[PDB]
Amino acid sequence: SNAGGSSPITGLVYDQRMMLHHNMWDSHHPELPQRISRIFSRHEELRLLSRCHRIPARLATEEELALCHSSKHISIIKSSEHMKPRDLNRLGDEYNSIFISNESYTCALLAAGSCFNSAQAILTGQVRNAVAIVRPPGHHAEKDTACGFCFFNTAALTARYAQSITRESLRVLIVDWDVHHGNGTQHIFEEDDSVLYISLHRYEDGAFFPNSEDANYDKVGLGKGRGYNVNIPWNGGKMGDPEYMAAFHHLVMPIAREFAPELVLVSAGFDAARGDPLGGFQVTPEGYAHLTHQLMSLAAGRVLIILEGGYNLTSISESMSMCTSMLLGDSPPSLDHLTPLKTSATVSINNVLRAHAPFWSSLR
Numbered sequence: 001s002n003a004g005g006s007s008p009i010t011g012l013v014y015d016q017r018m019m020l021h022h023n024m025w026d027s028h029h030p031e032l033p034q035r036i037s038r039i040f041s042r043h044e045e046l047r048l049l050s051r052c053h054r055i056p057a058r059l060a061t062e063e064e065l066a067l068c069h070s071s072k073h074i075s076i077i078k079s080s081e082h083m084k085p086r087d088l089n090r091l092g093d094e095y096n097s098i099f100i101s102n103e104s105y106t107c108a109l110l111a112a113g114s115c116f117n118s119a120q121a122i123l124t125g126q127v128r129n130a131v132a133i134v135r136p137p138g139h140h141a142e143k144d145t146a147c148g149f150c151f152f153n154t155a156a157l158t159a160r161y162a163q164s165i166t167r168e169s170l171r172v173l174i175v176d177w178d179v180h181h182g183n184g185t186q187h188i189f190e191e192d193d194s195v196l197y198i199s200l201h202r203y204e205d206g207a208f209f210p211n212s213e214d215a216n217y218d219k220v221g222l223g224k225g226r227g228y229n230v231n232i233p234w235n236g237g238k239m240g241d242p243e244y245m246a247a248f249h250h251l252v253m254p255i256a257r258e259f260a261p262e263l264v265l266v267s268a269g270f271d272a273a274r275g276d277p278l279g280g281f282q283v284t285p286e287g288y289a290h291l292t293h294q295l296m297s298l299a300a301g302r303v304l305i306i307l308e309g310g311y312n313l314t315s316i317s318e319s320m321s322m323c324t325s326m327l328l329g330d331s332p333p334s335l336d337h338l339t340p341l342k343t344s345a346t347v348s349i350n351n352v353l354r355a356h357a358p359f360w361s362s363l364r
């Protein structure tokens with residue numbers, strides 16, 4: 001029972017089977033199997049694992065995938081399960097930045113099913129919040145195609161899965177703090193006012209992957225979805241804790257509170273972390289802890305943290321373990337001295353404010 005209340009529980013999902021997805025031609029490709037085992041091992045080292053309720057992985061079904069993806073796309077990825085290597089190579093090469101092994105399809109299904117089980121546990125009160133240590137990632141995957149190490153859009157599917165077991169209009173916030181724009185998530189929800197998508201990402205006037213002006217601040221959503229897509233694009237600066245904290249203070253949290261989400265999904269890539277070989281930014285583990293802590297003030301604390309990217313194995317292990325520590329209710333660690341904001345970060349924050357003040361009274 002929870003008569004009289006009870007201490008909130010944090011769920012954790014991790015299944016070593018998701019390590020089987022691998023790059024048979026470049027075994028040093030940074031989207032490594034041991035991304036998830038290293039993160040899991042750090043949770044054991046820090047004694048966080050035994051404090052969590054372990055949530056089992058499961059496979060997503062093909063009908064669950066159709067919540068966001070076309071039958072053609074599902075069928076093509078499914079067909080890779082039985083391909084020979086030369087045909088896996090050719091099929092991967094048809095996409096932007098995709099490698100495929102015979103286990104990729106099953107691993108993508110497990111990453112999605114793990115997050116469905118976690119959202120289910122949160123929404124039915126089995127746990128208050130959860131962390132999902134999953135791969136391959138999701139947020140670059142589109143309705144019709146794979147992209148950027150992602151086959152199916154785990155976070156987008158989880159938002160639709162949540163609506164499917166509560167009510168169609170359940171308000172879901174997705175905060176995407178992966179250093180890359182989540183092009184797939186933006187596109188899936190661009191006309192939808194029930195899912196608010198807020199992405200922070202390195203942009204560089206369109207030069208940074210995925211190299212599209214869709215990631216710019218002026219893309220605010222379409223139709224009913226106008227105002228429900230918030231891009232915070234970083235240009236010309238080595239961004240870190242001061243800039244992300246300022247973005248949360250001026251943009252993410254005011255908009256999120258006004259939206260009043262009923263569930264928060266974090267597309268939690270850690271490739272903006274200090275030390276990441278791809279992102280080039282310097283968010284610290286303590287910074288990620290503070291971002292997590294702020295999001296826990298939303299949705300009565302119903303937050304699911306979903307691993308996306310992040311490629312320095314030590315950085316992502318420490319950063320995601322910080323986030324779990326915050327979900328468990330530990331007191332936030334001290335931030336380093338916040339250097340004054342990079343001046344271009346103020347420019348970006350002010351551009352987003354101008355783009356979104358028409359839709360959010362909290363910004364006016």
Ligand SMILES: O=C(NO)c1cnc(NC2(c3ccccc3)CCC(F)(F)CC2)nc1
Pocket residue numbers: 029030097137140147148149178180209269271278308309310
């Ligand atoms: O998921 C991600 N990060 O979290 C992610 C990161 N990099 C790529 N692609 C790029 C990449 C691919 C393999 C190894 C390093 C980088 C290749 C094309 C590029 F040069 F344009 C950008 C980098 N794709 C997805």
Ligand SMILES: [K+]
Pocket residue numbers: 176177178179180181182199200201
């Ligand atoms: K992002």
Ligand SMILES: [K+]
Pocket residue numbers: 189190191192193194195196197221225228229
């Ligand atoms: K939206």
Ligand SMILES: [Zn+2]
Pocket residue numbers: 178179180269271309310
């Ligand atoms: Zn990324």
